[PDB]
Design a protein around this ligand. Structure first.
Ligand SMILES: O=C1CCN([C@@H]2O[C@H](COP(=O)(O)O)[C@@H](O)[C@H]2O)C(=O)N1
Ligand SMILES: O=C1CCN([C@@H]2O[C@H](COP(=O)(O)O)[C@@H](O)[C@H]2O)C(=O)N1
Ligand SMILES: [Cl-]
Lengths: 219, 220
């Protein structure tokens, strides 16, 4: 019990225009109830865009801020993000145990959630992250982290993440569509998929999001 | 130094106060001593990206956005472009996500005529778990990518020394961890061109005196 993602599909709203972002999000609201908001939108439109998303859509907000500073600064960032109304925040694990714990404390203090990003989906992730991915995931377990983010681009790596974090841990996965990940094969190990450009750059975002779901209902 | 964009008194202020009035007031009190301000997410997320342009116009200071950019290439480019649009002169980027992620930041910086600082090793205890073991390689990856500006830990003088010899004498190196995190200004400035200082100054009873005192110990 962590999050009830409708149709197991999370929207990565990375449009950097408020009117564009609100419009495309509105066109897939009937298919998506959980929206991931990142720095491209927030830095272009302000942290207030989170509250405006909650008010206009009644959707759950995951702030993909990939927090990666020292513990003290991590706390300030998490505190500002939750204050702005984020339900959960995504946090890098590579800065180490004390940096993650700093976020975990603020999340508990404010009654919100932390997602631990263990391994990234892009090719450069092989240089440093992939070799540390297992130990970061394990670190998360030792810290009592219940929420994780893993690479859709690597189904075998995503499967290892699942057996590390356990069956009752909650797992979401970006890199579906644009980066090359397949929706179905990703949902074999992950609870929900994150899809960005395959929806918000399509001619019809509604049809795109519906097309993704219609190839998933078997799962 | 004139071969690179240097910093007045080798002192960079880390302005991590989270409300506009205090941030503006403290920075103004120490403006006579610095000309470079590092602005991070604590201030920006609380007061908006407009605060970068405001500081730049009000104080005539160079702005380094400590955003520790650490996403995929595509998203890195969007973040850097938005940051430079906000008027920042430089942006700090994580190296751990790999070469393609750093190159995406470098492209936007070169396009818009701004700078990238590569964060190689962090200054907190947790940095020893995964970052330290990769820091040497991140540093030489940076050199190979064309990166000329770096960030290294003041809390570990021996690691900072290793970093300097990897990047050579021509690269520009700045270092946080002085004061609150226990780093010494003197030993750090043996390797770094400039120190980043936050709480030691901005939480002091007299921030101006705090900044002046640090510069004095640097001066000799
Ligand atoms: O490893 C990671 C974590 C962050 N993300 C984030 O997930 C989102 C994916 O968007 P796309 O579906 O357009 O690839 C985007 O916001 C990106 O920054 C990754 O794609 N991979
Ligand atoms: O490794 C790092 C990079 C980020 N920084 C940043 O540098 C600043 C340090 O200021 P303090 O003097 O208050 O520790 C603060 O903004 C922090 O987030 C580090 O301290 N260490
Ligand atoms: Cl004074």
């Amino acid at each position: 019990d962590v999050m009830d993602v409708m149709n197991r599909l999370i929207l990565a709203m990375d449009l950097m225009n408020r009117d564009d972002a609100l419009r495309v999000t509105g066109e897939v609201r009937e298919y998506i109830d959980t929206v991931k908001i990142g720095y491209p939108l927030v830095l272009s439109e302000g942290m207030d865009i989170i509250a405006e998303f909650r008010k206009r859509f009644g959707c759950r907000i995951i702030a993909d801020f990939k927090v990666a500073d020292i513990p003290e600064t991590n706390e300030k960032i998490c505190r500002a993000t939750f204050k702005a109304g984020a339900d959960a925040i995504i946090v890098h694990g590579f800065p180490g145990a004390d940096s993650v714990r700093a976020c975990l404390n603020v999340a508990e203090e404010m009654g919100r959630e932390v997602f631990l990003l263990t391994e990234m989906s892009h090719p450069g992730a092989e240089m440093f992250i992939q070799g540390a991915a297992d130990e970061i995931a394990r670190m998360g377990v030792d810290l009592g982290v219940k929420n994780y983010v893993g690479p859709s681009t690597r189904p075998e790596r995503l499967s290892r993440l699942r057996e590390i974090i356990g069956q009752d841990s909650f797992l979401i996965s970006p890199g579906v569509g644009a980066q090359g990940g397949d929706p179905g094969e990703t949902l074999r190990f992950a609870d929900a998929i994150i899809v960005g450009r395959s929806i918000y750059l399509a001619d019809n975002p509604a049809a795109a999001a519906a097309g993704i779901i219609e190839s998933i209902k078997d799962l």
